[PDB]
């Protein structure tokens, strides 16, 4: 039982991937766990929120060294685990193992990369075929991604999601009404939430990313006042400092992959909310 | 099969050819532009070296199935059938003022909605003229396989691939047969309509002891290749209009362009299938991508 | 069934598409030959393997191992000659690992051969391989020559040395490289007279090769040649070639000379080292290439150690010292790092006074080096300067350097200095840590980076171990307990981690009296994380604790923790109760 | 003053020889460094515009120039230029000097010797791609001009490839050497010498087994297809070596191998194809069922090629039983729309070609 999970976690800690049977068992248990919580998975302070690990497993190891290891540190993750397949399988397995091993201590959200088509395009499926040969691992993790919660509500005062605001939605009850157990299209409130970005130009604007809708500062402000949100946190947009403030310091963007693609050289950051829900940022460089 | 090498007419893809001629202070210049469609945002097109605007022709066909909008295919100076007052001059600023004068000559008084698509150095020209902002009406810019650092790094690969075929081709059908054999152009009709403008009518084997020739000389291009791509990425990101980039590989992107893209500045789509002739290897896919971009940004309306 | 039934299934496996099946059959060939008759294996099985076996690279590697192990199964040394052809083709295969392991197995089975058998079969094999058209066979024969030579007749020995001479003159640079590689061993096998007659011209010719690789391999063989030769003739024969190689245009040759410098010094003797090797080493330190300078740096300390006791100090001060000073301010970071790693061990060699006069300013300059790993390296080996000179003179300069190194912006530098710190505690003394470094330790403990915290905890264990439990009791316990009151939960559980680490070394009574009350107090922490880590702490420290206290206080608290809404704290409390056997 | 002009030519050669290059301190002798640059430019424009300016005394100084400024031991490969402009001027100067019609190979044959060629070749391992391109052009010109040195050049290149494939497996200049060799191949005599066949079998084929096949893959494919065009007989062994060297772990390498076999089949002969279908189609049937979508797409584009269809339809009976199981299994399981359409189109063609 939990002994097998602990051994699997140690194996992954040694940079060694798990087997197909272990992967499918973990996916089944994780689906059972994920079916329980709502789309807007509420989280209590304190917690550490991270940006997009983007499959750099050793960067994730550096992140754990900098902020602690589960279950000592309650971790919240925006998503985008699947990326350029350097070691994406290892990090996805480690996160799902932590989630199944500690349901309360670890909370993980669905990044917009977490889709079957996106996994195939960005080489995560190719990484799966290289590591295991069989495509079964990729299928199991895609099915698990279907169950991943869309958004997070930290202490009821802070909203967290991988992307940004959606024009179709103005209240959290709308997201609660949504169904997350489905493949994310290029449209709909869920895709708008996953791919939206904060923009200086006022009002809802067409996103240059190809999906979602860029929103103005006043959009975020009125959303917060309508829904009583102290702050909005997001990811999927790089910050050279690692953390960016915009829209009258009502939108904060966090990135946790240092030197993304090992060429950008950007610093990574993580945002820890303490017991009193006071945010602070911590920055780190890529591991040697 | 597919043994027919008769060049397809331009009429199917472009409804009209207008050889716009304007006499500048340096002299008369004829542009050999293609106009298609009745109403809708202008799809200005730019082709790379060794190609023609007619190479976009099949692509043009694809997009008329997707979105109804005026289409303008421009042939570059000293490229294709374009008649140029000064063939030797190929400066980037000269190209920018050239395309600006083309836009002024075409309508000038009332600028219709115009979005730009460019391939190889055509994309660089589109970026340069977008920075020049000579066109009063701009909607969006698209380039295909146009990255500054990668172009400076991989000039010789493109030069060798283009030079792979013999310089002298006895017949146009011979060039079309070469294209269908080598696989550089997936569509046979695209090859037929391409070579006709690509070539003109008038590294070495080490031995041991008139046919159609190259319209574009690779020596002068390689001489001036460095100038066109100077600061391409920064000027591309400086563009205020929306952009869309399509590339075969995501890793091929330069550091600056990767940072700008992931930051969410512009959309990218990855199509590994396309190789040397990226825009014409999968014209349907890139055409659908452009149509999706237009309908999302509401620049053009679907059928 | 069939008499050739194992052979039949071998034929089927060869026909079988599955390469893994062939690999399994090759691995099990040991058991197959064990079951099969010895004469049956010799008659057909070995010719079968020699003739029709063309397998994959790792399969052929396993086959080479199995043939190497067939020393016993063939019938002992009597029939090992029949083993030779099967290994012969395996030497010729285009892959490199297969021929390498095949020639290794051939060397192994050479000893089993009797001298009559060795001459009868093994020497013709070496002749065929050396005379083989392809260069790979010659490469394989290069290794065979050494094991072949010692036990054969003198005339055949002359033939073998002539064949080696022919191979060393081969046009293909690969064969020449292999010959240069095996030249040292072949010289070891050869007697001294033939060594002087043949190897020295051969070694000089190989050192004058156009290819840099051949020259650098000749540099390596030079050590063995110098070892074989008497010290008197080293000056006349091998020394000029060594000087010529030391001044080679290629940076790789000088790199190889620098790498093997200490071995060359030991082999050649102290006098020739003083008269000739010292100027070459000075040139190497002042070499244009940075890599050569770094390589020469790495060998500085050992070279100084191997110097003759009487003149070592004068030689180092007069000649080595100025180059050392020059390389201290070298632009390259790697060279400075290597020097700082190696320069110190010269301090015991020169003496305290010489270290103070010249070495000590160099140490002070190296401390202020901008690059971090250089300061890390000079900190690393500090025991030598510690012993040779007073600890106060070094400490007064180190303290500011330690301060900025500890407070480095990069967390990895802080981690490195914390790792290195306990040695500094042992060397400097308890009062030196207490006056200043305690604040550094506290800053590391409260540091936001978790790795810094855990390194600080391990360092704290080492500190209480080295300095006794009473020192930590007077100092460390109050501060670690006070640090628990942090508002942020992470720094709060850092105290629990410190308790877990300290409980083992501190002792039972000190465990009961002070931090047990704090752990019980924090057992009621609002955060689930702190609570289940309190349960984990009680699990870890329970064996040290007295049973009466365990039942009185630990047991009710653990029971309360078991009855909680949080699943993780429930599981950990139950596990701790089971482990401590309370419940 | 043409004689004075040639004497000043020699003097500027000496000046460019001495330590006034960009390698030295740009600030020290800054006017010297600049006049050295301008002197190289003047030399080049002089030897371009003027004619009959090449004399027998000229060759030794320019050769010594090239040796001094270029023949140096390569810097350490710390990777896992400020002096570049001057070096590039030297490269283009030497290139045009070779390109000079007044150049006489017989005169320079004493100045350009086997040692010169060997040092030029060892220069090829430079990290700079521009350096490699210039060296490629220089070696191509030298091989074109000097007939006597050609055998030594070929043998030295063979030695370089042997060391690469068997010992070091780390050479930056493989692609340039390969394209030069292909240029040489195009001129090979119709009856290939046994040396050339040994070069093909023992060198190029083992290049495939090398791990870093990606960097030099197109040039290797070009050389292989050039040999296959030269002789149809050599096709049969090579392809099985291709099968023998096929990777079982790397999908991108599998795509690269597909590419190569696609060109080979484009240039293949039916007599060899009937010999080589069975292992080739066995590997192909493994590839179509390979989970990687890119290898599947490439193997499906194989069916798109007309010549492959023609050759397969020539002998349906042998190929069809091998293709049927993998095709049927891939028919049962498919995920991507493009791969599904491609496999179904392949099924339609296979039904058409035989029933």
Author numbering:
A (entry chain C): 6 to 293
B (entry chain P): 37 to 238, 251 to 257, 283 to 376
C (entry chain A): 7 to 589
D (entry chain B): 34 to 113, 128 to 402
List sentences quoted exactly from the publication behind this structure:
The cellular functions of PP2A rely on the formation of structurally distinct diverse heterotrimeric holoenzymes; each consists of a dimeric core enzyme formed by the scaffolding A and catalytic C (C or PP2Ac) subunits and a diverse set of regulatory B subunits. PP2A holoenzymes are highly regulated by carboxymethylation of the PP2Ac tail, which is reversibly controlled by PP2A-specific leucine carboxyl methyltransferase (LCMT-1) and methylesterase (PME-1). PP2A methylesterase 1 (PME-1) is a cancer-promoting enzyme and undergoes methylesterase activation upon binding to the PP2A core enzyme. The high-resolution cryoelectron microscopy structure of a PP2A-B56 holoenzyme–PME-1 complex reveals that PME-1 disordered regions, including a substrate-mimicking motif, tether to the B56 regulatory subunit at remote sites.
To define the structural and molecular basis of PME-1 interaction with PP2A holoenzymes and dissect its multifaceted activities, we determined a three-dimensional structure of the PP2A-B56γ1–PME-1 heterotetrameric complex using single-particle cryo-EM. To trap the enzymatic intermediate, we assembled the complex using the fully methylated PP2A-B56γ1 holoenzyme and an inactive PME-1 mutant, S156A, followed by covalent crosslinking using glutaraldehyde. After extensive 2D and 3D classifications and careful separation of the tetrameric complex particles from the unbound holoenzyme, the structure was finally determined at an overall resolution of 3.4 Å. The PP2A-B56γ1–PME-1 complex adopts a pentagram architecture with a size of 100 × 100 × 90 Å. The PME-1-bound holoenzyme has a similar overall architecture to the holoenzyme alone and maintains the majority of intersubunit interfaces, but exhibits three major structural changes. The N-terminal 10 HEAT repeats shift significantly by increasing distances of 4–12 Å from HEAT repeat 10 to 1, resulting in a 12 Å shift in B56 that alleviates the steric hindrance for PME-1 binding. Most prominently, the interactions of the B56γ1 internal loop (IL, 110–130) to PP2Ac near the phosphatase active site in the holoenzyme (right) were abolished in the holoenzyme–PME-1 complex (left). Finally, the methylated PP2Ac tail no longer occupies the A–B56 interface compared to the holoenzyme. The PME-1-PP2A active site interface remains essentially the same compared to the core enzyme–PME-1 complex. B56γ1 interacts with PME-1 at three separate interfaces involving both PME-1 structured core and disordered regions.
